[PDB]
Amino acid sequence: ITCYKTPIITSETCAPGQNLCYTKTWCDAWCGSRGKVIELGCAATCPTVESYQDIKCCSTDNCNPHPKQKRP
């Protein structure tokens, strides 16, 4: 699959075996001013996260865009 990858948005092929994309977020000490921190990448199985983090996996090419891109 292809997925979006942090740190400076690009779309790349995941290694064989990885058939999902993920979006992982979490607050920071600067969350109210700056917003959540977001991480994007490839995954073989959806990553387990810590109780203070959130994750959402998908399975279609480039399905995890940064919510601030170029389009519409």
From Swiss-Prot:
Disulfide bonds join 3-21, 14-42, 27-31, 46-57, 58-63. GO terms for molecular function: acetylcholine receptor inhibitor activity; ion channel regulator activity; toxin activity. Its main location: secreted. Gene3D superfamilies: CD59 (2.10.60.10). Expressed by the venom gland. It is found in: Secreted. Transmembrane segments: none annotated. The keyword DNA repair does not apply. Signal peptide: none annotated. InterPro entries: Snake_3FTx, Snake_toxin-like_sf, Snake_toxin_con_site, Toxin_cobra-type. Pfam families: Toxin_cobra-type. GO terms for cellular component: extracellular region. It comes from the Eukaryota. Keywords: Acetylcholine receptor inhibiting toxin, Disulfide bond, Ion channel impairing toxin, Neurotoxin, Postsynaptic neurotoxin, Secreted, Toxin. Belongs to the three-finger toxin family. Long-chain subfamily. Type II alpha-neurotoxin sub-subfamily. Binds with high affinity to muscular (tested on Torpedo marmorata AChR, Kd=0.38 nM) and neuronal (tested on chimeric alpha-7/CHRNA7, Kd=12 nM) nicotinic acetylcholine receptor (nAChR) and inhibits acetylcholine from binding to the receptor, thereby impairing neuromuscular and neuronal transmission. The toxin also shows a very weak inhibition of GABA(A) receptors composed of alpha-1-beta-3-gamma-2 (GABRA1-GABRB3-GABRG2) subunits. This is Alpha-elapitoxin-Nno2a.
